[PDB]
Amino acid sequence: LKLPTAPLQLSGTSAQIATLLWQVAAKENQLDKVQDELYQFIELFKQHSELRRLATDPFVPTLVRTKIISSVLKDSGASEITKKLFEALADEGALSALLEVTVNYEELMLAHKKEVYCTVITAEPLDKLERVELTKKAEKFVDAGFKLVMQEKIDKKLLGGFVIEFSDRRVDMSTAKKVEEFNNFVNKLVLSI
């Protein structure tokens, strides 16, 4: 057999269910169809107490817990892979793993969407050419066809330049950093001679 590659490698036992749920929804091309009905079940657990009793109660029988699931998923937005999932998650009492498996499904999705939720901190509010050439500067820190959306903030203790915050990675192209690194360099080098 074969399966499409995941966009990002990630964690175990709830993030490998989400990798496989992404790996069969990429083959059936319903990648954003499975994602919203994952959000529907989270809303279904919000307003139904008898549906979350099939996820948290240890005393529900494993046959009763899997027969309510198949008797409410009958060919209406079924998608055959969020329907065969929920039998397999009620076969083992893992319906409580849904709030964990959709979070990993989302972070697999925007890596497929090629978007990175950036953040830029600049000393003063930007011009429309500072924005454009800052955008062209910032695509060297994402090594794909990755789009950036920005959340531009203001910090006057930066003396120009900018600080990029990728929420897992920070690039400090500000000039306060440049003058303090310059001072560290020249205060180190005169001790070397």
Partner: peptide
Amino acid sequence: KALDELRKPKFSSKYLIQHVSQKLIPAVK
């Protein structure tokens, strides 16, 4: 909030992926 009981999942099997992999790869047509 009422979904903090679904915040922490707990599994009766380490090989939970081996059952959903037997129920999802024959669920692609």
